[PDB]
């Protein structure tokens, strides 16, 4: 088993004896490589500091792989982080939070992966939630943020491809760039009509967004607005301005533990090492100085990604999406409670899903229970 450096970058408070224990706990005897576990810590969120840590990666020893987790709200941190790793062109995996957050604008050679699938799969699960909500009429509202034409795009892909008449009112495009002095976003709120609608933006974006929603107050009883995980932002961060009881979905914060999944991602780097020296008949050559690595880059072989394509471990499939997302991630639906706490709304298992209740919470007209016996005509 070739020794492979396993560098766990722990952001903020974490249990190192638990994670490192799992590193000692989990050892793959069917593996042709050996882990060298490393616990890295940076108390600061400075992107520059992140870069300095990248310098620490090889500065410590030859770096086999980069495991970093995020407890903070800064996604672009993970972004330019993956940019740095792209300059490094080495294996790296975001383990939590922003590090686990969906990374827009996948770079050409970027190998960065994380637990959980793309917003692509996400919104699909949202449609499934509509199947739960059984409200066939809906719409979409979003700002100019990345994945816009993508989210609306595959959204439409769900739309027109159906054998059922499930209605889609429209798709509301917005942006943060235009001067808010016009307040025309409030007019877009006036444009909001349909009982169900889709909402896509960031949580920081949800500041002005949902703030204006309170301005229109259009979110009142009967108004269906739901957003994804990163759209909702952090699990434990609840702003007051967030929509009451708003439906959402995420990778599992409650079920899936970050230090728990740490050993998992370790095993992911392992399964990466599984076929590496076997088929390639070579070992990873770490760049001594990544800034000075411009020389050794001639012999680079991208088959590591080709190796990284199909992967499975511990009964879990470590294969990832060619777009970089998770090939078959597990989903968790959630919504805020009367305590202003996001409460698990269900889980989407592949296409399949399981709701937590036979009906939405539902929190004027009521029911019209409309019980009947079918007698044709």
């Amino acid at each position: 088993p070739p020794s492979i450096g396993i560098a766990v970058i722990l952001v903020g408070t974490s249990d190192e004896v638990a994670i490192k224990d799992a590193h000692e706990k989990d050892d793959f005897h069917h593996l042709s490589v050996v882990p060298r576990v490393e616990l890295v810590a940076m108390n600061e969120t400075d992107p520059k500091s992140i870069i300095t840590r990248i310098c620490d990666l090889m500065s410590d020893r030859k770096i086999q792989g980069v495991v970093f987790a995020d407890d903070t709200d800064q996604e672009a941190i993970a972004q330019i982080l993956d940019f740095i790793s792209a300059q490094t062109l080495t294996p790296i995996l975001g383990i939590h939070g922003g590090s686990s957050m969906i990374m827009a604008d996948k770079d050409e050679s970027s190998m960065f992966f994380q637990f959980g699938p793309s917003i692509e799969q996400q919104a699909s699960v949202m449609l499934n939630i509509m199947e739960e909500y059984d409200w066939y009429i809906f719409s979409i509202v979003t700002t100019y943020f990345p994945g816009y034409q993508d989210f609306v795009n595959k959204i439409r892909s769900t739309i027109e491809n159906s054998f059922v008449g499930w209605e889609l009112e429209e798709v509301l495009l917005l942006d943060m760039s235009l001067d808010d002095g016009d307040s025309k976003i409030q007019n877009q709120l006036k444009k909001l009509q349909s009982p169900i609608i889709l909402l896509y933006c960031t949580k920081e974006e949800a500041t002005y967004i949902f703030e204006v929603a309170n301005s229109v107050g259009l979110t009142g009883y009967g108004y269906t607005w739901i957003v994804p995980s990163l759209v909702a932002g952090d699990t434990d961060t609840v702003p007051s301005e967030f929509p009451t009881g708003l439906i959402s979905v995420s990778y599992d914060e409650w079920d899936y533990g970050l230090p728990a999944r740490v050993r998992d991602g370790i095993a992911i780097i392992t399964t990466a090492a599984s076929d590496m020296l076997s088929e390639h008949s070579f070992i990873p050559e770490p760049k001594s100085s990544c800034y000075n690595t411009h020389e050794k880059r001639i012999y680079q072989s991208n088959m590591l990604n080709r190796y990284l394509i199909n992967v499975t471990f511990e009964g879990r499939d470590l294969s990832f999406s060619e777009d970089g997302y998770q090939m078959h991630p597990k989903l968790v639906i959630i919504l805020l409670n009367k305590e202003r706490k996001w409460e698990r709304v269900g889980k989407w298992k592949d296409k399949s899903l399981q709701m937590k209740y036979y009906v939405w919470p539902r929190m004027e007209d009521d029911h019209l229970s409309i019980v009947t016996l079918e007698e044709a005509p």
Binding site: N153, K154, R156, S157, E160, N161
Partner: protein, 50 residues
């Protein structure tokens, strides 16, 4: 995919058609069976006539 023969009153309308505007008459077959339709692929999300 093999050489075959072409005859039809439609095809005839092609014959007289070129008989109006001279052009070298070339005859092809249809790969698939259908006529044509705008169709959504499994990727890239672009409706495509077929």
């Amino acid at each position: 995919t093999v050489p075959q023969c072409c005859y039809g009153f439609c095809i005839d309308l092609l014959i007289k058609l070129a008989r109006t505007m001279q052009f070298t008459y070339e005859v092809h077959l249809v790969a698939d069976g259908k006529f044509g339709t705008q169709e959504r692929v499994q990727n890239s999300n672009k409706k495509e006539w077929n």
